[PDB]
Amino acid sequence: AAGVAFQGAVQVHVVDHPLAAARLTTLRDERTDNAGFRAALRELTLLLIYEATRDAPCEPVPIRTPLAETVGSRLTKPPLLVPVLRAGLGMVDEAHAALPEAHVGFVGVARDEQTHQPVPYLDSLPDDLTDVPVMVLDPMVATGGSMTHTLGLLISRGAADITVLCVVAAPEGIAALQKAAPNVRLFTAAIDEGLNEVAYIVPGLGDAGDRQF
């Protein structure tokens, strides 16, 4: 937990938190059913959301309360959340709960049976100009192709500071992160060994989408 620097000075932060570890140990077990995999994934997403939303600026708000008037606080950056589909959709339906005020955009990638190159059909996103913080929500950061391709259109609209949330990433994937966007930050629950013949992360979680749907 620091986490590491890597090649393009890609900054990674490893959520080593105990309840993080426990949810993670639930997510990888092959004994666990898709329900418990969805629920484990969800509660694990707020952990990442919390570790990433630390240095998020704020803003005072004039407020009442019961028994007289007082002043509170309210975050000031409106985080665009971006689920990478298919897999990053369990993560979003209560990042909302963590971040109610935050808006959602849709871009993603899907992999070929053999070549493994990302397929790109979709474009339903905001007017994502400059000063807009963007968290990308993808569980398995594997080769990077899927990740690299979303950020490819993020930065095309001039996406500012980028954070990426993921349960597990691989040294291949983070490397293709540095090559793509040197000033994006990455939050994982674990770094792994690497990929395999089928570019699945190992040990990892299996196919993250399949065991939610």
Add this chain to the structure above:
Amino acid sequence: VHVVDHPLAAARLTTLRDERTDNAGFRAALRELTLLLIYEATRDAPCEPVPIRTPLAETVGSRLTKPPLLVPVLRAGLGMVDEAHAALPEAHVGFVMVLDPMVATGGSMTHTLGLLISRGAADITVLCVVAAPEGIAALQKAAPNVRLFTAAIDEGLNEVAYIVPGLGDAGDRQF
């Protein structure tokens, strides 16, 4: 006394305070705030390894060895627990992490902590959203090893012994 100044916390606390907010949003911004308290207060927690196998290959995870006995204090700290079970699924529950939105005077809490360590309760953690100096004063008066996690420290209580500014009556704003 550990004050969770995290922005999501300060936000959620801002919402609990507000008079405009419905009990439901009150109940929603409380449960969600209780998670942050859990996350800060469990960050030095002892663990334990677990041999498991993934669908692909075999490895070793971490249990957390000694999960806590939650204790919610009635009537107020039960809108906390039905989401604290989400954070800690293996936590057992009693009626130690003590769960109570307003530590005001401290009697309700210390009366609980008196029967906690009666039986032999080691390290205790307390979780509230708001505390009064009076209540914290009562605390170490009773157990001076306990730790306390709160979203803010307020001025103190008033004539009726409510925390000011505070949120009102935390029980009344959920039930």
Add this chain to the structure above:
Amino acid sequence: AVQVHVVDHPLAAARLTTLRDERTDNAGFRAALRELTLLLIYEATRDAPCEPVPIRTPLAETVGSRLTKPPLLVPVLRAGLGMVDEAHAALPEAHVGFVGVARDEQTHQPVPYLDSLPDDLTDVPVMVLDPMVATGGSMTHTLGLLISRGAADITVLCVVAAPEGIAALQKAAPNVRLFTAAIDEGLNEVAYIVPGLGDAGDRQF
């Protein structure tokens, strides 16, 4: 006795089957409980009232309905708080009151403890929530203090019922209505419902 309503719905039966299996982890036990509750709520809230109310859409003026008299929820603890935090969702407008009870491992009696409510007056519908209505002592104790304040119509939502428990119900109150997922065989040596689910409390806490 009477009046029982068995929720024999497809999803309801699957959730009960999960709740009964001993193989199921208590996280899955609370989740299947949680889910199985709304089904009971949905059935018990079919002959509820409505207003209608004037509201405005982003596009036109219209009228909807709400509930005129949303019920006072009364979870029976220790067991019945896995039930209530999702009933909340189904009925946002419902208020909550609390009492708890504890049946012994010898005397067979519940040591009731709780008196945390909204004082009585109406003409207030009440939905008492507790998963196992076995002996009836826990239930009957609660209903005594509900109708002590003058409780009108009482609904009881539970997971499983025993004939002995239902027998005590119309011993205490013959006008309450009961919604169960199943009526079982009865109790045992230890005043547990057989086949049942075991202890409903222990399997969430």
Add this chain to the structure above:
Amino acid sequence: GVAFQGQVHVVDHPLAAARLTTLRDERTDNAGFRAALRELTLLLIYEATRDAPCEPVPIRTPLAETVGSRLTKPPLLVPVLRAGLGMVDEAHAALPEAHVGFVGVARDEQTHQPVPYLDSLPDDLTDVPVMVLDPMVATGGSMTHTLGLLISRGAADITVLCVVAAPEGIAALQKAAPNVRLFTAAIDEGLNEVAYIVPGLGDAGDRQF
């Protein structure tokens, strides 16, 4: 409380009507809008799944052996993106065993026709029930697009869940598919200049995201 037309079933339930009223209100926060949506989704599921738990289950309780039931043939859920995803993380709650498929389309500004795109779909042949989830069945284009590719893969009986439908959308349904079943909480008068349903709720997506 259900109801019928003449395929269409209007869920006139007290909680459904209470939850519906909340979805239209403009005063409600989008969080409460999605919270109100979440509950009203299950109500529709419960009314629409009055059927099929035709498997008994041998199980054993902590106090002796007994037999229960589960559901045979659990439906493939198909939320229409981006709107009907506030619905599906809790349909999951209703139907734990249900697998999920994705197939979204938006509506264009002017023009009219939905620019379609989306093929994240399981291995579907014949005897597989489908419950499509989308809050607003307006023009019918978004829906029929989905159903066009569902029944390309030989989809059997199809159910559609929505919060409100317009007469124009249901018109579009039975010309695309005359055997599909529809479940809404209310039937409104219709669409407007820009093809929003009036009274409706405004835009169901924007009111969650």
